[PDB]
């Protein structure tokens, strides 16, 4: 087999300086590269690491058309909701996984990077919608949520609320209220050729035998 070369951009995803708010989660498409998943699955850094529809023992010798890395910041208590068939404000209104998801959820605590004294209010989540998200939908709408029966004028007031809250990430928050950075890897196969594959191992070359 040829030299291991053109390794996938997981460093650009996992070691980005700036992450998204969970209501406006970023998606990166990974394609046409060698994915060594070993640098993820046997890293001790992650607090959560688990996969659905695949064992990590069967990564590194599977091929896919595309991989999507979706990424955002949430409370450490909410990482619970980033799984198939869950419910709560994050699963219902911010980021929904399919029930038949094939992919991995990875998370790590980040209160050294993106918490500060007096709070880091730069991260937000939807607190309200008229309905739940469907799988892999995003909603960046800002329109004032009319919560009660009274027709709202399109501005904040009684029974009519601004739809996003902000996280109060103090560095002294208890572990469930700390920030966590999350990456969700979603794997797909189409009738297009596979472009993302695990690294091919090679033996030595022996001659005259």
């Amino acid at each position, epitope marked *: 087999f040829p030299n291991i070369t053109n390794l996938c951009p997981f460093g650009e995803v996992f070691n980005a300086t700036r992450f998204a708010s969970v209501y406006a989660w970023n998606r990166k498409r990974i394609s046409n590269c060698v994915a060594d998943y070993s640098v993820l*699955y046997n890293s001790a850094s992650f607090s959560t*690491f688990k996969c659905y529809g695949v*064992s990590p*023992t069967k990564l590194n010798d599977l091929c896919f058309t595309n991989v999507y890395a979706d990424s955002f910041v949430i409370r450490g208590d909410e*990482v619970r909701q980033i799984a198939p068939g869950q419910t709560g404000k994050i699963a219902d209104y911010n980021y929904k996984l399919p029930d038949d998801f094939t992919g991995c959820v990875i998370a790590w605590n980040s209160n050294n990077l993106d918490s500060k004294v007096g709070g880091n209010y730069n991260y937000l989540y939807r607190l309200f919608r008229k309905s739940n998200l469907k799988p892999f939908e995003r909603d960046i709408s800002t329109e004032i949520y009319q919560a009660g029966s009274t027709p709202c004028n399109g501005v904040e007031g009684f029974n009519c609320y601004f739809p996003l809250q902000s996280y109060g990430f103090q560095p002294t928050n208890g572990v469930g209220y700390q920030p966590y950075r999350v990456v969700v890897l979603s794997f797909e196969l189409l009738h297009a050729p596979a472009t993302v594959c695990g690294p091919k191992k090679s033996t030595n070359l022996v001659k005259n035998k």
Partner: antibody
Amino acid sequence: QVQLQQWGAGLLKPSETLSLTCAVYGGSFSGYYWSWIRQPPGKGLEWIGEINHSGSTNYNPSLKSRVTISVDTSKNQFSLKLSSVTAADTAVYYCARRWWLRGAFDIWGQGTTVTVSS
Amino acid sequence: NFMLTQPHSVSASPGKTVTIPCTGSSGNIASNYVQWYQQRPGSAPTTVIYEDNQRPSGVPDRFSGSIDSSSNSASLTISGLKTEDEADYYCQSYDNNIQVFGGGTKLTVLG
């Protein structure tokens, strides 16, 4: 296919040093996680420590102060020293393999009974 | 810090179904995979569940695993007991670079 075979002195007395060896047949160290695990008489399993893929040690913080794990790659062989033993170190000791960091203990050595008694 | 706890013993008559619980504490059990091992007396353990739901090749479909992120609990179900199922059962997981085992449950098949 892969087999773990272990040996060492089982009968010891207090303040000696335990020294167990485990050897791998039908396979090799480099890609996998290798651990020592113990089971006191009539009690549950306790993980002592490991060698990761490529050979760095990690230890259970409760035993880290007096334990040493090392690989002799020339023999596909690795060992546990556990120093200044007490009667509480009396257990069956197993070497075991794990395929990746958070995976199952997929292969186990045959065990070795250690009795610490004056 | 993180700990798994199990009942000391469980029993039912042959042909019935039993569930063995495994409860997490000082952390959340759903964050990493859970394994279950069977240990028959005087021998090394063997895995019967190897990721939360997943059963090894050569293990009977009578054994099934589950997990519950609301109860902070895993469980092992053995369904249609045989007298050969009588053994210790241990749950296990990873946290904070330590491998943690539950205290073990003796299953007796009530003969």
